[PDB]
Amino acid sequence: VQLVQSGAEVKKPGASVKVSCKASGYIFSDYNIHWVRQAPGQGLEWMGWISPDSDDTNYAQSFQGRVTMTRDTSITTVYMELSSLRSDDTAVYFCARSVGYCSLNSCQRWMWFDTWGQGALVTVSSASTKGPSVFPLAPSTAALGCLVKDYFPEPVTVSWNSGALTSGVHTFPAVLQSSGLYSLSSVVTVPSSSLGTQTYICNVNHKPSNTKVDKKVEPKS
Amino acid sequence: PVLTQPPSASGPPGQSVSISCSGSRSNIGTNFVYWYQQLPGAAPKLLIYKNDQRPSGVPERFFGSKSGTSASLAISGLRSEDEVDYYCAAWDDSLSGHVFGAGTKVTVLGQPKAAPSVTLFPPSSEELQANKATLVCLISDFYPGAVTVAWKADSSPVKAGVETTTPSKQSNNKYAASSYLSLTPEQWKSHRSYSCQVTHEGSTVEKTVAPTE
Amino acid sequence: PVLTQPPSASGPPGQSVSISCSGSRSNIGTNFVYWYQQLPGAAPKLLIYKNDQRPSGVPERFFGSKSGTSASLAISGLRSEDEVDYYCAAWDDSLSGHVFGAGTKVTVL
C-alpha cells in the first residue's frame, strides 16, 4: 500500500484546490476513501465517504456544499474540488485509507483507518507567492546573519559560504504577520577578531518565483 | 457532543502510564473507540482497533481497553526516544459521523537551568534606503524554553504590534526563539538606545546595542 | 554660490564612473543636494531625493551620495535607454532659491 502524491499549492480564499493521492497495489472497487485534515491544537473533522462503485455518497451536517466529490475509474484516483476556503482551513491534507465497505448508516462502527503516508497541505492564504526584495542585515564573541522578508510561502533555505558551513545553522520559526509575511532567521557565530574583514554572504532560494538573491552583509554606517 | 482529551501527560520512564478519554452514553461503549498516534513530521498510524485486537506491526507492548464512559490506553513503560501524541476517536448516532479528541502530550520526568545569551541585530543602510526600518533580536543557548521577549527603549516600552515566536527544539539539546519588530525610519531615529529582554523564569539580561555600528 | 557642473560627461559603458558637482561655501552640506532629470522635449521627473532613499518607479542604478563639499553621483552599469539629461539641484540659505549648474550631457563612447 502507498499514498505517494504531490504537495498542494497555496490557494486564495474563494478559489479551488486539488489534492489527490495515488492508489496502487490493490483494486479500487471495495475500499471507500476518506478525507480529513489535521487541525493544529485540536481534533479532526469529517464530512463524508466516497464510494467508487455507486453514486451513493452523502454529506455531514456541517459540510453541505463545502466539498464536491468526483470519481474516476480509469486512473483509480479520487479528485478534489474545494470551494470558499477560509481561515480555519490551515491544516495538512491526508487521504484516509479505510478497510472494508459500508453504505447504510449502521455498519460504519466496525472499520478502522488503515494507511497514512505523505500527506499534502492546503491552507487559505491572504498573502501570496511574491518575489522577495530582501536586503542585507548589519551585525551587532560576535554574531551576524541575514533576515528574509516579503516572501511567500514557507519555507526558504539559507546557506552560508556556498553550503560549506553547516555548524550553528538553525532555522528560527517565523511569525504570522498582520500583512501575511513571514521571517525566517538564520545566524552564525564568529570570533570577535573578524567582524568586517572577512566577507560573509548568505544564499536564499525561492521556489515558485525562481529567483536567487546573493546578498553580502555589511556593518551599519 | 465533542470528545475531550487531556492536553498533556506527565509520566516518568520505566513505569506504566495510561490516558483517559471521557465521552458520552451514545459515543463510548455502544461504539468502538480507536486510538490514533502520529509522529512529528510524519504520517499518523493506528495504535489499537476494536479495543481488544492489536494490529500487526507492533510488539506486545501497548494495551487499550474501554470501561463505560472512558476508554483507557495503557502504556506499559515509556522510552525517552519516542514521545507521540495519542488521539481519541469514536462514533455517534445523533451526529452520524466521526468525532475526534483533543490529543495528549506525553513527557518524561529534571535538569538544571543554563545561561541564556541574547544578541541584537540593527539594520544596515540598505534596509533604511527603502524608507523602512525593522529590528530583530534572537535568544539562544537557554534550557528550558517558555520564554517571552519584549522590546524596551530604556525609558518606556513600545507596543506597535509586538510579536514573539514559539520556542523550537534544536539538535544540540537546547531551545531557541526570536522576536521581530518593524517600524518607520522617522520613529527609528527618535531613540538612540534599543534593547530587548528575555524571561528565563529567574534570569533576565539586557542587550544594549547602540544603532551606530 | 553658483553650482559648478561639467557640461559633458565621458562615461564609458560597462564600468562604473562617478561625477562631481561642487558649489561654494555655505551651499553644500548645510542643505541636501538633489538629483533630477528631464527628457528632451518632455516633462522633468525625479531621480534621487535626499541622497538616502531611492524613489519608486526609478530603477536602482544611480547611487545617491555626498562626501564633503563635492557631491558624488555613482552609477552601476550604462544603458542606451538611460541617456537622460541629469542635473544638479541644491538649496542655498544665502540665496533663498534653488541653485542649478550647467548640466551634464552623457554621450556613449
Question: DSSP per residue over chain A, as a string?
Answer: ----B-PPPPB-TTS-----B---SS-TTSPPEEEEEE-TTS------EE-SSSS-----SS-SSSEEEE--SSS---EEEE-S--GGG-EEEEEEEB-S---STTSTTS--B----S-EEE-B-SS--------------EEEEEE--S--SS--EEEEGGGTB-TT---B-----TTS----EEEEEE-TT-SSSS--EEEEEETTTTEEEEEE-----
Contact across the interface for A138 and B97, Cβ inside 8 Å: no
Say if residues B145 and B167 touch (Cβ distance below 8 Å): yes
Q: Which three cell numbers stand for residue B57?
A: 506491526
Say if residues C35 and C89 touch (Cβ distance below 8 Å): yes
Q: Count of CB contacts below 8 A, A vs B?
A: 128
| SS3 state of residue C68 | coil
Say if residues B44 and B141 touch (Cβ distance below 8 Å): no
Local structure of residue B50 (DSSP, 8 states): T
| SS3 state of residue B188 | helix
Task: Quickly list H helices, chain C.
Answer: none
Q: Which residues of B touch C52 (CB under 8 A)?
A: 128-129
Contact across the interface for B130 and C52, Cβ inside 8 Å: no
- B126 to chain C, any CB pair closer than 8 A? The answer is no
Instruction: Name residues 89-148 of chain B within 8 A of A (Cβ).
Output: 89, 91, 95-103, 119-127, 129-130, 134, 136, 138, 140
CA separation for the pair A50, A68 (Å, rounded): 10
Cited resolution, angstroms: 7.8
Q: Which residue of C has its CA nearest to B131?
A: C53
Q: To probe the interface with B, which of A34, A121, A185, A213 has the most B CB atoms within 10 Å? A: A185
Q: How many C-beta atoms lie closer than 10 Å to residue A150's C-beta?
A: 15
Contact across the interface for A140 and B120, Cβ inside 8 Å: yes
Q: To probe the interface with B, which of C53, C60, C63 has the most B CB atoms within 10 Å? A: C53
- B129 to chain C, any CB pair closer than 8 A? The answer is yes
DSSP of B93-108, one letter per residue? TTTTEEEE---BEEE-
Say if residues B161 and B151 touch (Cβ distance below 8 Å): no
- Touching partners of C (3+ C-beta pairs < 8 Å): B
Q: List the end-to-end C-alpha distance of chain A, in Å, as a whole number.
A: 60
Q: In what order do the strands lie in the sheet with B34-38?
A: B44-48, B34-38, B85-92, B97-100
Q: Which residues of A touch B140 (CB under 8 A)?
A: 170, 187
- B130 to chain C, any CB pair closer than 8 A? The answer is yes
CA separation for the pair A104, A106 (Å, rounded): 6
Say if residues B212 and B122 touch (Cβ distance below 8 Å): no
Task: Quickly list H helices, B81-172.
Answer: 125-129
**A15-20 long-range Cβ contacts below 8 angstroms, 24+ apart:** A15/A85, A16/A81, A16/A82, A16/A83, A17/A80, A17/A82, A17/A85, A17/A122, A18/A79, A18/A80, A18/A81, A19/A80, A19/A93, A19/A95, A19/A120, A19/A122, A20/A77, A20/A78, A20/A79, A20/A80, A20/A95
CA separation for the pair B200, B203 (Å, rounded): 5
Q: Which residues of C touch B129 (CB under 8 A)?
A: 52-54
Say if residues B139 and B178 touch (Cβ distance below 8 Å): yes
Q: Report how this structure was experimentally obtained.
A: cryo-EM
Nearest-CA distance B64 → chain A (Å): 15
Evaluate whether chains C and A are touching (3 or more beta carbon pairs less than 8 Å apart): no
- B65 to chain A, any CB pair closer than 8 A? The answer is no
**A204-212 long-range Cβ contacts below 8 angstroms, 24+ apart:** A204/A132, A204/A134, A204/A146, A204/A148, A204/A156, A204/A157, A204/A158, A205/A156, A205/A157, A206/A131, A206/A132, A206/A151, A206/A156, A208/A129, A208/A153, A209/A129, A209/A130, A209/A131, A209/A132, A211/A131, A211/A132
Q: Which three cell numbers stand for residue B161?
A: 504590534
Q: To probe the interface with B, which of A21, A220, A221 has the most B CB atoms within 10 Å? A: A220
Say if residues A201 and A216 touch (Cβ distance below 8 Å): yes
Q: Which residue of B has its CA nearest to C63?
A: B129
CA separation for the pair A184, A163 (Å, rounded): 17
Q: How far is CA B49 from the centre of its chain?
A: 28
